[PDB]
């Protein structure tokens, strides 16, 4: 129970969740497949942003470079004492009966948390259409490992198809948890115990929406603890 909350995905929703939880002293483990992609935008994030959010703090009105936004956001997360940001590729759910206690990782070492949050964005069943090529990636140059979706599918989880687009321009078709799997008020993926989901992998929205959702989840978990 080292981590009170284990979050899979250091993107706009997952990192925001980690941010507010850490501000309150919650022991958070933020697991993400690529540290070089932490909080990486598609198009440059532009105001307005949720007040006091990690998203707002990471913004620089004089620097629109998306990679720089990623770097500034990553650095901000690394400054939170109760937060441990680490690299690992989640490949499946660690279960004890009907309870999710963590995730298996491709590299081998399992990661555990009292509560497990999936904030994997557009990386489930991702297909990136760029010109005359189709890549298995949730965002430009960011590969998507098929394992997690396969595990969730094997366990019985239902998904719906969604699509996002970047004005080279490209489109990303991905899978989001079917609405019936998710309890909006608690962020619970009710099919199993101790499992939560937030962000694009459960509901559409832009950067600010992802951030607001992450904060809302953090506030809910703080109440539950
Ligand atoms: C093609 C496309 C373009 C978009 N463009 C914009 C835009 O220009 N402006 C805007 O406001 N919104 C845009 N959106 C909507 C939304 O704001 C973004 O998708 C945003 O990144 C969603 O936040 P998220 O936290 O759900 O996912 P992300 O920010 O994508 O973060 C997901 C994280 O999870 C990690 N991850 C995934 N699977 C695993 C795994 N198995 N193990 C470990 N880590 C994993 C990823 O590597 C990543 O770091 C776009 C959406 C799409 C699909």
Number of domains: 1
User: Outline, from the CA principal axes?
Assistant: globular
Biggest sheet record: 5 strands, parallel
CATH class type: Alpha Beta
The CATH topology annotation reads as: FAD/NAD(P)-binding domain
Label the structural class. Answer: alpha/beta
Bound small molecules, deduplicated: flavin-adenine dinucleotide
Question: Strand order within the widest sheet?
Answer: 3-2-1-7-16
Order of helices and strands: EHEHHEEEEEEEEEHEEEEEH
What is the overall number of helices? Answer: 5
PDB class: oxidoreductase
Keywords: Rossmann fold, RIKEN Structural Genomics/Proteomics Initiative, rsgi, Structural Genomics
Assembly: monomeric
Entry title: Crystal structure of the GidA-related protein from Thermus thermophilus HB8
């Amino acid at each position: 129970a080292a981590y009170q909350v284990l979050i899979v995905g250091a993107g706009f929703s997952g990192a925001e969740t980690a941010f507010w939880l850490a501000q309150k002293g919650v022991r958070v483990g933020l697991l993400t497949q690529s540290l070089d992609a932490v909080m990486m935008p598609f198009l440059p994030p532009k105001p307005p942003f949720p007040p006091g959010s990690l998203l707002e703090r990471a913004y620089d009105p004089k620097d629109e470079r998306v990679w720089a936004f990623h770097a500034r956001a990553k650095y901000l997360l690394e400054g939170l004492r109760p937060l441990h940001l680490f690299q690992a590729t989640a490949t499946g759910l660690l279960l004890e009966g009907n309870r999710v206690v963590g995730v298996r990782t491709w590299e081998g070492p399992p990661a555990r948390g009292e509560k497990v949050v999936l904030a994997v964005g557009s990386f489930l069943g991702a297909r990136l259409f760029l010109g005359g090529v189709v890549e298995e990636a949730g965002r430009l140059s960011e590969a998507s490992y098929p394992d997690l979706l396969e595990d969730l599918s094997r366990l019985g989880f239902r998904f719906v198809e969604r699509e996002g687009e970047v004005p080279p321009g490209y489109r990303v078709r991905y899978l989001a948890f079917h609405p019936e799997e998710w309890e909006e008020k608690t962020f619970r993926l009710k099919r199993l115990e101790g499992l939560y989901a937030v962000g694009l992998c459960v509901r559409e929205g832009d950067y600010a929406r992802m951030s607001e959702e992450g904060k809302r989840l953090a506030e809910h978990l703080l109440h539950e603890l």
